[PDB]
Amino acid sequence: XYSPT
Amino acid sequence: XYSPT
Amino acid sequence: XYSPTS
């Protein structure tokens, strides 16, 4: 994996 | 990822 | 790859 931006 | 069976 | 430059 969980890695948004 | 690695989830067999 | 993953190079999120800013």
XYZ file of N, CA and C in Angstrom, unseen atoms left out:
45
model
C 2.219 -2.934 -0.943
C 1.293 -1.738 -1.120
N 0.840 -1.188 0.000
C 0.000 0.000 0.000
C 0.881 1.245 0.000
N 0.897 1.968 -1.117
C 1.763 3.134 -1.226
C 1.197 4.151 -2.209
N 0.239 4.971 -1.796
C -0.270 6.031 -2.667
C 0.671 7.231 -2.687
N 0.233 8.271 -3.388
C 1.003 9.507 -3.481
C 0.082 10.719 -3.572
C 3.382 -11.835 -3.292
C 3.442 -13.297 -3.728
N 3.396 -14.177 -2.734
C 3.596 -15.610 -2.912
C 2.564 -16.404 -2.121
N 1.408 -16.668 -2.723
C 0.316 -17.363 -2.045
C -0.038 -18.633 -2.806
N 0.630 -19.755 -2.520
C 0.311 -20.999 -3.233
C -0.993 -21.624 -2.770
N -1.354 -22.752 -3.383
C -2.552 -23.534 -3.053
C -3.757 -22.695 -2.624
C 12.092 1.217 -10.976
C 11.008 2.238 -10.649
N 11.001 2.684 -9.398
C 10.033 3.657 -8.914
C 10.760 4.890 -8.388
N 10.781 5.959 -9.186
C 11.545 7.168 -8.883
C 10.625 8.383 -8.925
N 9.826 8.593 -7.880
C 8.897 9.729 -7.881
C 9.570 11.042 -7.519
N 10.247 11.651 -8.463
C 10.908 12.903 -8.182
C 9.899 13.997 -8.038
N 10.238 15.014 -7.275
C 9.336 16.132 -7.099
C 10.103 17.437 -7.025
